[PDB]
From a paper:
The FfIBP structure is composed of parallel β-strands in a helical pattern, which is mainly stabilized by inner hydrophobic interactions and intramolecular hydrogen bonds with long α415. Additionally, the FfIBP has a capping head region that consists of two small turns and β-strands, which contain a disulfide bond. This disulfide bond increases the overall rigidity of the protein and reduces residual movement at the ice-binding site, thereby augmenting TH activity and protein stability.
Based on the CD and MD simulation data, four mutants annotated as FfIBP_CC1 (A101C-A120C), FfIBP_CC2 (S96C-L132C), FfIBP_CC3 (M249C-N270C), and FfIBP_CC4 (G160C-S176C), possibly forming disulfide bonds, were generated. To confirm the disulfide formation, we solved the crystal structures of the FfIBP_CC1, CC2, CC3, and CC4 at 2.0, 2.1, 2.0, and 2.0 Å, respectively. When the RMSD values of alpha carbon mutants were compared with the wildtype, relatively high RMSD values exceeding 0.4 Å were observed around the mutation sites of FfIBP_CC2, FfIBP_CC3, and FfIBP_CC4. Unexpectedly, in the case of FfIBP_CC4, the Tm decreased by − 5 °C, possibly due to conformational distortion caused by disulfide bond formation and a decrease in protein stability. However, we postulate that the forced angle change due to the disulfide bond negatively affects neighboring residues involved in the hydrophobic core, such as Trp174, Leu178, and Val198.
Residue numbers in the entry: 61 to 276
The structure:
Amino acid sequence: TLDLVNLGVAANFAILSKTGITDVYKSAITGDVGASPITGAAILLKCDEVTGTIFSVDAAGPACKITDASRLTTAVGDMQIAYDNAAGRLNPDFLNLGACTIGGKTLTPGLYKWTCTLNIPTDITISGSSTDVWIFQVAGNLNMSSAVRITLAGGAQAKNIFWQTAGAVTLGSTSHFEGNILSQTGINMKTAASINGRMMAQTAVTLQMNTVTIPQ
């Protein structure tokens, strides 16, 4: 079996970025959100959009913000360790599956690697036990089309799925995603897309009327 990616303090966040969080009102986020080292003014969420705590490095940001530089410093550092751990896994089970377009696949547990932009234009299933692990290594961008749903089968849990992307993620409008996203750049969601997972971006997270839930 594949070892879990350890997220350390970043596990406590539904959204964690380095250059902020933009939003087209209204989104529904369940879990804590933060950004560091950017000012909390870069978190464009309202208090009614977050069930959890909004963390700021400073006195700026949404009215309900909690200022805690040292926790955000640890979280972002733990996110970079996680990113490097996920990107550093060797001996993949698959390389360039579906020639970088994986619509209609059922993905069984293991380490997958793509030396390309990964596209998900139609529904996929992730199928495995409640203890199985998936690590998806994407050297490029990751695109999922409007209305595409990731279905979990067999007991597979969102908390045991990790998507490591060297490029930006784009989740199309009304798409449903499952798993943790460790992005070296942005995570960009569209109109009423949902995610059961964490959005961990070393640039920005951008939302448009999204539902975001930390995995349970």
